[PDB]
JSON list of C-alpha atoms in Angstrom, two decimals:
[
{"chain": "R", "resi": 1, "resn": "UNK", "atom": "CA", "xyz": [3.60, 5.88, -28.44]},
{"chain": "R", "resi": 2, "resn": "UNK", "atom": "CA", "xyz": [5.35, 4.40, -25.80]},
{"chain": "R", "resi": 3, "resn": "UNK", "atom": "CA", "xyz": [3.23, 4.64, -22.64]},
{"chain": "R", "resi": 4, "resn": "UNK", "atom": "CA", "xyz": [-0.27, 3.85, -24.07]},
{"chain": "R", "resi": 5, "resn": "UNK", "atom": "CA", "xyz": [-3.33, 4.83, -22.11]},
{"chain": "R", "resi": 6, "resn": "UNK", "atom": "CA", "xyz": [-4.90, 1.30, -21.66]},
{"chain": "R", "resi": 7, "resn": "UNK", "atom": "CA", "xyz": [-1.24, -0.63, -21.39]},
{"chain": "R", "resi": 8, "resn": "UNK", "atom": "CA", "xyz": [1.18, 0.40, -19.19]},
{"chain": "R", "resi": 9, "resn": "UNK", "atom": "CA", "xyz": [-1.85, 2.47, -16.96]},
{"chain": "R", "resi": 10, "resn": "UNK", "atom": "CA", "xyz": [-5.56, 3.58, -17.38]},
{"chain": "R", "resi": 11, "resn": "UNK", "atom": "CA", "xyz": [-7.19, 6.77, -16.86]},
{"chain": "R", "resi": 12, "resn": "UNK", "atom": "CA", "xyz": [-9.98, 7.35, -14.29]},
{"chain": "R", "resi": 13, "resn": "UNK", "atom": "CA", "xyz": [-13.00, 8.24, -16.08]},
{"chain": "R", "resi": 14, "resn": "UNK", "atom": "CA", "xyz": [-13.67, 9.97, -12.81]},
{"chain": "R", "resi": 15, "resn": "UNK", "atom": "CA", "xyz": [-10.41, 11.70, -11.88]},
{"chain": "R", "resi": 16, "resn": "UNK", "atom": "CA", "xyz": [-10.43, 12.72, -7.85]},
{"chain": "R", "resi": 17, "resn": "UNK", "atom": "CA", "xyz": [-9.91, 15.93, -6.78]},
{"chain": "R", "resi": 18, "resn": "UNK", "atom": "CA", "xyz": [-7.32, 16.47, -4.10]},
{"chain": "R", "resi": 19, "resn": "UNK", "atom": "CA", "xyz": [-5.69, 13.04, -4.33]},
{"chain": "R", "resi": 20, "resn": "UNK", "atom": "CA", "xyz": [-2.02, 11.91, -3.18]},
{"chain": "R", "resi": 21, "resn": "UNK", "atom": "CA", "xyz": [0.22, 12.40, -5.94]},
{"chain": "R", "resi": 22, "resn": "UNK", "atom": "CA", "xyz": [1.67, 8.43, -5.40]},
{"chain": "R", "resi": 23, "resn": "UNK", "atom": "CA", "xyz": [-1.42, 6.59, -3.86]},
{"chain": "R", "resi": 24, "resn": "UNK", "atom": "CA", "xyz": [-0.53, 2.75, -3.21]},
{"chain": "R", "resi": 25, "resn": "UNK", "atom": "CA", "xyz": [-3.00, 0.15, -2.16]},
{"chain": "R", "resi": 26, "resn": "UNK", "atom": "CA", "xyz": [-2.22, -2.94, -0.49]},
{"chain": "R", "resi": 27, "resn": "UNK", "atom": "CA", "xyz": [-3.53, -5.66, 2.05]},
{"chain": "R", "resi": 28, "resn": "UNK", "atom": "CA", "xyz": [-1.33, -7.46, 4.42]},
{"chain": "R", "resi": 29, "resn": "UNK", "atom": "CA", "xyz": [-3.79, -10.54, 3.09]},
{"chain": "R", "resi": 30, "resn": "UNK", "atom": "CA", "xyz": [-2.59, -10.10, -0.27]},
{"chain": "R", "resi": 31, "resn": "UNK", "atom": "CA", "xyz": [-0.62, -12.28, -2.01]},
{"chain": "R", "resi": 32, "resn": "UNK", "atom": "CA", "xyz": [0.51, -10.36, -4.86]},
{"chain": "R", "resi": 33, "resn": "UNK", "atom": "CA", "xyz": [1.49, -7.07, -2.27]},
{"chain": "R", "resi": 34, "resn": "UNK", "atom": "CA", "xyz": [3.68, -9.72, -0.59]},
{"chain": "R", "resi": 35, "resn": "UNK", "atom": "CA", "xyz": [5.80, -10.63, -3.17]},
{"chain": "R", "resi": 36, "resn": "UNK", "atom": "CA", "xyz": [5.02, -6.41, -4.35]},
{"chain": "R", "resi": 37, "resn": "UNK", "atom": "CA", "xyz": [6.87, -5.90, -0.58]},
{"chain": "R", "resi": 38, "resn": "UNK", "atom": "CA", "xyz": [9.08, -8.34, 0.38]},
{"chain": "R", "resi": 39, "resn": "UNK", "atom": "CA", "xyz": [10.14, -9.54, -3.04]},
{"chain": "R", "resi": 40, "resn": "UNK", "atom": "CA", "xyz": [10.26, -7.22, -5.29]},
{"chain": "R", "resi": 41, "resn": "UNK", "atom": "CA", "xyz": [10.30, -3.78, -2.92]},
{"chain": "R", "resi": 42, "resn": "UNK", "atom": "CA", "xyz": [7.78, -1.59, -5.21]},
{"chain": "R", "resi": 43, "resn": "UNK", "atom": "CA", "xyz": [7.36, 1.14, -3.27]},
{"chain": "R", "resi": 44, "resn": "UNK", "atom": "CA", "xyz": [10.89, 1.59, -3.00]},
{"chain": "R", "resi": 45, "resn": "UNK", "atom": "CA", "xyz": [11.64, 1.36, -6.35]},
{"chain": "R", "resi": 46, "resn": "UNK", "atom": "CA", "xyz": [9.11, 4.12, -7.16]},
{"chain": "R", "resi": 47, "resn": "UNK", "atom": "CA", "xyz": [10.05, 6.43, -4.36]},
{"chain": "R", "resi": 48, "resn": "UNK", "atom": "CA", "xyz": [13.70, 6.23, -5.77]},
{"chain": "R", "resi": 49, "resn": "UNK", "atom": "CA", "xyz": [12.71, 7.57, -9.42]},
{"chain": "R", "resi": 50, "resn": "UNK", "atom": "CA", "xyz": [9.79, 10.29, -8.01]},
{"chain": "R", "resi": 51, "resn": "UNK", "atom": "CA", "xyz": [10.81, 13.38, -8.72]},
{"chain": "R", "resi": 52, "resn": "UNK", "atom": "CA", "xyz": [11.89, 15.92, -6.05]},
{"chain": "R", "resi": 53, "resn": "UNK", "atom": "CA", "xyz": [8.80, 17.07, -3.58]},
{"chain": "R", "resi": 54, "resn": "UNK", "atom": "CA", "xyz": [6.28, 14.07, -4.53]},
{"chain": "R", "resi": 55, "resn": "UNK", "atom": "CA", "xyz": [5.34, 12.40, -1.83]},
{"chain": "R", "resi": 56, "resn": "UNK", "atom": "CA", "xyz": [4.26, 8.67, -1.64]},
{"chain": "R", "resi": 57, "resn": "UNK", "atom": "CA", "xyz": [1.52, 7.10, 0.55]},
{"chain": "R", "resi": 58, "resn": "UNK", "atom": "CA", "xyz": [0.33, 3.97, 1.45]},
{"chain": "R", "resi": 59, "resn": "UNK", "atom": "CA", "xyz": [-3.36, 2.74, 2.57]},
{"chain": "R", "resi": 60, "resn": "UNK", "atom": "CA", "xyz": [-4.13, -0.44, 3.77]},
{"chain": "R", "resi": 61, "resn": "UNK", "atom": "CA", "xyz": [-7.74, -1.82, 2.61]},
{"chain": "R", "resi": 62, "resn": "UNK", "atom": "CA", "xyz": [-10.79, -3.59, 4.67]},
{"chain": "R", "resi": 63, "resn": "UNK", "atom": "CA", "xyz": [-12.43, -5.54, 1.63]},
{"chain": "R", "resi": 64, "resn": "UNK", "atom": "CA", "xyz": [-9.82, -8.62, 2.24]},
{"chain": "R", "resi": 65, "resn": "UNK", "atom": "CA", "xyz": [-10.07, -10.57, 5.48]},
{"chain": "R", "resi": 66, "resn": "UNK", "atom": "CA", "xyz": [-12.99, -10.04, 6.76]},
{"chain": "R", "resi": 67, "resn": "UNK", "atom": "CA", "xyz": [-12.57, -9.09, 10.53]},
{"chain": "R", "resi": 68, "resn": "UNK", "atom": "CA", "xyz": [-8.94, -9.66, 10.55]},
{"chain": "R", "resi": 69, "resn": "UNK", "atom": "CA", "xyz": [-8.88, -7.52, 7.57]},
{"chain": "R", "resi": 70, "resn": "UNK", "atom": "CA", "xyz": [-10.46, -4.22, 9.20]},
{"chain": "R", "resi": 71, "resn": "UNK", "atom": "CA", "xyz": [-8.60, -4.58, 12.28]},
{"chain": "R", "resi": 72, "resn": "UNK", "atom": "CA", "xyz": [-5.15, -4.56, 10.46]},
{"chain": "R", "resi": 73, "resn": "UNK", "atom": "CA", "xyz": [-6.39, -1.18, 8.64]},
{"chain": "R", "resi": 74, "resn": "UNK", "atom": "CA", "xyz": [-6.56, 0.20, 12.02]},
{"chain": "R", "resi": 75, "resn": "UNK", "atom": "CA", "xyz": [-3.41, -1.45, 12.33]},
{"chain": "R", "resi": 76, "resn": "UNK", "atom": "CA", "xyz": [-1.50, 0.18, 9.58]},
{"chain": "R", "resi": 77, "resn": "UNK", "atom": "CA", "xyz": [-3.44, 3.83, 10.85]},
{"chain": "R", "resi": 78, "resn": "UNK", "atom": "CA", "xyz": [-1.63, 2.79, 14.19]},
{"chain": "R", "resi": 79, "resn": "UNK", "atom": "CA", "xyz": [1.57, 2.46, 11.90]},
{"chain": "R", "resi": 80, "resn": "UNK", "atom": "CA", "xyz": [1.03, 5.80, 10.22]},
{"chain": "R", "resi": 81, "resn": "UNK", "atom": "CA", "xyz": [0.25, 7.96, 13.69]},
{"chain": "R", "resi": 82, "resn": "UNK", "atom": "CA", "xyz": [3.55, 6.20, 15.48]},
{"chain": "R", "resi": 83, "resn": "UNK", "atom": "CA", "xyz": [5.69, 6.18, 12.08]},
{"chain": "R", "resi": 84, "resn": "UNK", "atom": "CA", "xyz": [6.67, 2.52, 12.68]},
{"chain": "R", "resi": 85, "resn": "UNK", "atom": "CA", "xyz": [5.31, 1.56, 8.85]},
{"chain": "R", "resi": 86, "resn": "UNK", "atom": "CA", "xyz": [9.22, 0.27, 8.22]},
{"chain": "R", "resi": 87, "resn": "UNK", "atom": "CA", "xyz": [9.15, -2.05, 11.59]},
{"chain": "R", "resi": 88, "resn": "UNK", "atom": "CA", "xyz": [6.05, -3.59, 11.33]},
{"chain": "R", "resi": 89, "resn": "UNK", "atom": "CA", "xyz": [5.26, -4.05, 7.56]},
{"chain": "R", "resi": 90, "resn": "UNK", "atom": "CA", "xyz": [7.79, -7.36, 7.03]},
{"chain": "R", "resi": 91, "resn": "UNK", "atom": "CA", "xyz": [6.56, -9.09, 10.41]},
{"chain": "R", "resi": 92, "resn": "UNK", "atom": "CA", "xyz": [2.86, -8.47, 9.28]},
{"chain": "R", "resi": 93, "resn": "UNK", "atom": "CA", "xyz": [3.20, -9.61, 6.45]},
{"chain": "R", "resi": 94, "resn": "UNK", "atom": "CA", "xyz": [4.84, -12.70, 7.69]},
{"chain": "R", "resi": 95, "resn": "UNK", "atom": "CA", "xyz": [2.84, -12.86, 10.13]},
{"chain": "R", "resi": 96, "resn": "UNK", "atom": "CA", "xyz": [-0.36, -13.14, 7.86]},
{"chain": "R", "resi": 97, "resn": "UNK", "atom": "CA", "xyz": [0.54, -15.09, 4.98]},
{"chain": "R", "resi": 98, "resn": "UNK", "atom": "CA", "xyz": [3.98, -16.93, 6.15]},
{"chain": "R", "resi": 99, "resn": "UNK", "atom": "CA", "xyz": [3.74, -18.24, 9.48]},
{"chain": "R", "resi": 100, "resn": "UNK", "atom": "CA", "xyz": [-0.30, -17.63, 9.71]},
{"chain": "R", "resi": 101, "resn": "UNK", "atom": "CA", "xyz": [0.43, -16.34, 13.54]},
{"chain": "R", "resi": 102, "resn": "UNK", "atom": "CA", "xyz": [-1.96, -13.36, 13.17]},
{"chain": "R", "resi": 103, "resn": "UNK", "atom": "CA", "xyz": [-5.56, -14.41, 14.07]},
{"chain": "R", "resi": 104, "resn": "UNK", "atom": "CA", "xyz": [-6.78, -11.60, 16.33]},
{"chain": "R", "resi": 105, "resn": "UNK", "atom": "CA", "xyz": [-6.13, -8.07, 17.09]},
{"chain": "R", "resi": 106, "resn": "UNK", "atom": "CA", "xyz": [-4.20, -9.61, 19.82]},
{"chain": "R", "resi": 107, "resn": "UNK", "atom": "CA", "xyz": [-1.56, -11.05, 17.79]},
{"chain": "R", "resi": 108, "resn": "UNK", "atom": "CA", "xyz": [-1.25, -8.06, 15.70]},
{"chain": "R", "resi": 109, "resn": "UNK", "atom": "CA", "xyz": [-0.38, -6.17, 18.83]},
{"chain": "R", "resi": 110, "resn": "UNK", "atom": "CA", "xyz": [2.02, -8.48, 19.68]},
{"chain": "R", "resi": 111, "resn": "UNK", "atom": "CA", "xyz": [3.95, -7.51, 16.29]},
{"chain": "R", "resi": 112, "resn": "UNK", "atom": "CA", "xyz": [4.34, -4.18, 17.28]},
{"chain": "R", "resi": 113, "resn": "UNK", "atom": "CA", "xyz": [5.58, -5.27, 20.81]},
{"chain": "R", "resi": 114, "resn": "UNK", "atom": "CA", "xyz": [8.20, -7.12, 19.63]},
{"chain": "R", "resi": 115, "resn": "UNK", "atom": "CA", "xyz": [8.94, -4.56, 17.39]},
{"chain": "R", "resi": 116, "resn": "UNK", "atom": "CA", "xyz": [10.15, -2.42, 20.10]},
{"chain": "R", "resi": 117, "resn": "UNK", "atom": "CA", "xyz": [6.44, -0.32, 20.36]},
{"chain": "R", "resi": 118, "resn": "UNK", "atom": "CA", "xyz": [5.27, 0.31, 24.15]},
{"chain": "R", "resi": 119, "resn": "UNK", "atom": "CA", "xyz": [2.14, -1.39, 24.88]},
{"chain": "R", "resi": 120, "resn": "UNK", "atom": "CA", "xyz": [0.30, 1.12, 26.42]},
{"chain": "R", "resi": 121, "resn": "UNK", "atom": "CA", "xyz": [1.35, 3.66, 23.32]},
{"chain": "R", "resi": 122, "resn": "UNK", "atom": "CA", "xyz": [0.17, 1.08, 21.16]},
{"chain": "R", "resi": 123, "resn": "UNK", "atom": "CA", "xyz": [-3.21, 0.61, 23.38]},
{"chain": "R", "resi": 124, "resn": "UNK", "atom": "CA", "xyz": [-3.28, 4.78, 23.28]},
{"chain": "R", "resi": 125, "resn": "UNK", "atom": "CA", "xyz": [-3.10, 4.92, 19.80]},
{"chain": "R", "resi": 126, "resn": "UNK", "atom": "CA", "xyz": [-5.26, 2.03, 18.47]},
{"chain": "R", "resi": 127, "resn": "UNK", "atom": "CA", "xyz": [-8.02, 3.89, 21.06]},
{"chain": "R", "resi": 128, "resn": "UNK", "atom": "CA", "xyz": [-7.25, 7.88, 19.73]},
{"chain": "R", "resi": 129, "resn": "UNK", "atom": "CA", "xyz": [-9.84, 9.79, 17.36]},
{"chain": "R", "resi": 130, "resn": "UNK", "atom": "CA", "xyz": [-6.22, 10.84, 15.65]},
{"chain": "R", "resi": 131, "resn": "UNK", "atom": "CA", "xyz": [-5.97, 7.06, 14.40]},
{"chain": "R", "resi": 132, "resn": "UNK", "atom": "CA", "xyz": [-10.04, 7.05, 14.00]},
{"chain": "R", "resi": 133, "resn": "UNK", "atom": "CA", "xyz": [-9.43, 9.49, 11.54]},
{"chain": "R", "resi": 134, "resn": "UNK", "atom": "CA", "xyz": [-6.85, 7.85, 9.86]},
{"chain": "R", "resi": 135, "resn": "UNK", "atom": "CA", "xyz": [-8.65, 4.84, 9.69]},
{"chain": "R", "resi": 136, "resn": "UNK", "atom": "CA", "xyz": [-11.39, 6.92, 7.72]},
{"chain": "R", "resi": 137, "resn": "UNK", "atom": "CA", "xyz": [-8.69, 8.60, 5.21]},
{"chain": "R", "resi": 138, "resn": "UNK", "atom": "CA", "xyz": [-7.59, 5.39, 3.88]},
{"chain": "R", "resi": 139, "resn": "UNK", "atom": "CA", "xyz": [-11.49, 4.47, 3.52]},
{"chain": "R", "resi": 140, "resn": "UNK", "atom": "CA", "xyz": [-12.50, 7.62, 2.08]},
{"chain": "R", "resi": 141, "resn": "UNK", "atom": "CA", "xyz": [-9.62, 7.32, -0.46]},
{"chain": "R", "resi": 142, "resn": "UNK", "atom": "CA", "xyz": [-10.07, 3.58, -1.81]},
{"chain": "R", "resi": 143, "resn": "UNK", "atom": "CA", "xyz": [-13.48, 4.65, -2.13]},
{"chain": "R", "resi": 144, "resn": "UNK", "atom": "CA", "xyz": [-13.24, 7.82, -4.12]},
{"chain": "R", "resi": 145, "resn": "UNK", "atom": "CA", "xyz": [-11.29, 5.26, -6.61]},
{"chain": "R", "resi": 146, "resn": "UNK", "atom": "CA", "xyz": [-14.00, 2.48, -6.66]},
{"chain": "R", "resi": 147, "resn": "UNK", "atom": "CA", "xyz": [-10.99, -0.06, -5.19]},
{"chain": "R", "resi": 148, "resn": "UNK", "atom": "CA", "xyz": [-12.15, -3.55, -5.74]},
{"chain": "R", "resi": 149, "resn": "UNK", "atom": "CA", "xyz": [-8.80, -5.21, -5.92]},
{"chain": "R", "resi": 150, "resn": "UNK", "atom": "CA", "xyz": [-5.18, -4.44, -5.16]},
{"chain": "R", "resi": 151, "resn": "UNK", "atom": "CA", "xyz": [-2.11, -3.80, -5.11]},
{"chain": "R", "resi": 152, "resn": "UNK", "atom": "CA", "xyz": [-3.17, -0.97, -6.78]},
{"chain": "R", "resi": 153, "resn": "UNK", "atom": "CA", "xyz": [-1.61, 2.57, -7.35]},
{"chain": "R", "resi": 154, "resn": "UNK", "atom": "CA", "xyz": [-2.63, 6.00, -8.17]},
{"chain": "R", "resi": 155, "resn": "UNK", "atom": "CA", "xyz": [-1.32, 8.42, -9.76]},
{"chain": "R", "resi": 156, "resn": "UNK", "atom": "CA", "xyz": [-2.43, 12.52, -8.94]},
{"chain": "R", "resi": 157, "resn": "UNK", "atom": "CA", "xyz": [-5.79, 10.71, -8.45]},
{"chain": "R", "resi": 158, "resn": "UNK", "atom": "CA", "xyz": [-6.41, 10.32, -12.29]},
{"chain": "R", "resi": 159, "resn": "UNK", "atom": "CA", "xyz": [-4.18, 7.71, -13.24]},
{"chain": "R", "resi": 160, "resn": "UNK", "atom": "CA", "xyz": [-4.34, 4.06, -12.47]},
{"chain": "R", "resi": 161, "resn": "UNK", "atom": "CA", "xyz": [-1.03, 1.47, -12.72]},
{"chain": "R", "resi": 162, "resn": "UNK", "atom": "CA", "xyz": [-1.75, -1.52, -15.25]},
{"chain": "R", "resi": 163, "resn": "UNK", "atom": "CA", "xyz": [1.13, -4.25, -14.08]},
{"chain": "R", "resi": 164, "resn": "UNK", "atom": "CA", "xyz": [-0.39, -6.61, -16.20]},
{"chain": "R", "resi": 165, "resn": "UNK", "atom": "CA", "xyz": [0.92, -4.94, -19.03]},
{"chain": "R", "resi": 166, "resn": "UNK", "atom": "CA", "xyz": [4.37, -5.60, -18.27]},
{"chain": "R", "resi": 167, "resn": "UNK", "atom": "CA", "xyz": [6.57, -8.80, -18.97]},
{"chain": "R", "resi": 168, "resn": "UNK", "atom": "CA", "xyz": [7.64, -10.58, -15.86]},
{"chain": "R", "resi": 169, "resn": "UNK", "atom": "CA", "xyz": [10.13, -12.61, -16.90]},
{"chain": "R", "resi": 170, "resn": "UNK", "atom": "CA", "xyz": [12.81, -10.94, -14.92]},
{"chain": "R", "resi": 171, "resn": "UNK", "atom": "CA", "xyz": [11.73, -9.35, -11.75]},
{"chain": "R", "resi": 172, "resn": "UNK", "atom": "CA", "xyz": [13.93, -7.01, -11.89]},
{"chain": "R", "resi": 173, "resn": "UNK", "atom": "CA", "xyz": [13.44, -5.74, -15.26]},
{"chain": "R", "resi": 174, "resn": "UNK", "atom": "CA", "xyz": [9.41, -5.50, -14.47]},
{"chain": "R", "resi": 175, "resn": "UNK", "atom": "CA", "xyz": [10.23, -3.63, -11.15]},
{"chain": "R", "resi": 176, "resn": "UNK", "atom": "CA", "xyz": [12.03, -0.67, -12.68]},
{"chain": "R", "resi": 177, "resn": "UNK", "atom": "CA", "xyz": [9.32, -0.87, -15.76]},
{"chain": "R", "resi": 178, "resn": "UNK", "atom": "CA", "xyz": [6.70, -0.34, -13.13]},
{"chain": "R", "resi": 179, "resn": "UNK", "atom": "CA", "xyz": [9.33, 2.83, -11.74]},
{"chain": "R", "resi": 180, "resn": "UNK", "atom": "CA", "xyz": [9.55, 4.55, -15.15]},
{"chain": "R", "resi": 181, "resn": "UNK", "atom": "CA", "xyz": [5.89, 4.30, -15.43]},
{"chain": "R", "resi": 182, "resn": "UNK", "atom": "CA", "xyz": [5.04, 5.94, -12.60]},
{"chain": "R", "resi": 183, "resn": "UNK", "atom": "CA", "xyz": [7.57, 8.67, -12.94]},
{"chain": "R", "resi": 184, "resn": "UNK", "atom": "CA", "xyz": [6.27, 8.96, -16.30]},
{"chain": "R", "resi": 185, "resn": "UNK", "atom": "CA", "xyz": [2.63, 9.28, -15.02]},
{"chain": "R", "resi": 186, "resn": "UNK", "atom": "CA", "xyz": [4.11, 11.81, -12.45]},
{"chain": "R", "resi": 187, "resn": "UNK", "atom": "CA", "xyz": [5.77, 14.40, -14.69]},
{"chain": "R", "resi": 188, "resn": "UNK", "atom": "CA", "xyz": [2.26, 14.40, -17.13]}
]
């Protein structure tokens, strides 16, 4: 056919039960989910092809980084409770892997300053059990999926995005491939 199991995606021998319908992976240390963000804008490529009343999430991950790594997944849980994901995503990124000023929790919180965020509801919110338990969400699901590298994205918990079975010879044309595949996956 035309979307092959083992191609284009691969199925989860071990489908999970109650997953996100669009599950997306990603680490602001990651070099790939860079360009996946700030070059070639993914997730907002899928969300524009999901069919009406899927919704999309995103989960940081703690296996990149080391320390740095695990505070910016209570970071991006910070993100999540304050819905601020669309100010601070580009200047952590940036931050990370293009001007390399994030090297403590410190600096991270200075991101969110400047992006307009209170300190003290940013101190309030990095402290909650609200955030605590957002923080163990985006655990729980990376491991349900056995995540040992990303970006990465699920699909209803049972199906797995293959990018490297797509030609990438024109962003573009590899960006709305990636689309179609996971509206494809969606409508199974």
């Amino acid at each position: 056919a035309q979307y092959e199991d083992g191609k284009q995606y691969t199925t989860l021998e071990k489908p999970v039960a109650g997953a996100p319908q669009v599950l997306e992976f990603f680490s602001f240390f990651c070099p790939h989910c860079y360009q996946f963000e700030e070059v070639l804008h993914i997730s907002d490529n899928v969300k524009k092809k999901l069919p009406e009343g899927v919704k999309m999430t995103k989960y940081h991950v703690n296996f990149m980084g080391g320390d740095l790594g695990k505070d910016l997944t209570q970071a991006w849980a910070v993100a999540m409770a304050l819905g601020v994901e669309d100010k601070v995503t580009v200047p952590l990124f940036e931050g990370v892997q293009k001007t390399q000023t994030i090297r403590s929790a410190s600096d991270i919180r200075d991101v969110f300053i400047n992006a307009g965020i209170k300190g003290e509801e940013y101190d309030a919110a990095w402290n909650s059990f609200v955030v605590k338990s957002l923080v163990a969400q985006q655990e729980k699901a990376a491991a349900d999926v056995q995540l040992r590298g990303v970006p990465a994205m699920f699909v209803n918990g049972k199906y797995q995005l293959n990018p490297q079975g797509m030609d990438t010879s024109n962003m573009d044309v590899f960006v709305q491939q990636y689309a179609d595949t996971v509206k494809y996956l969606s409508e199974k």
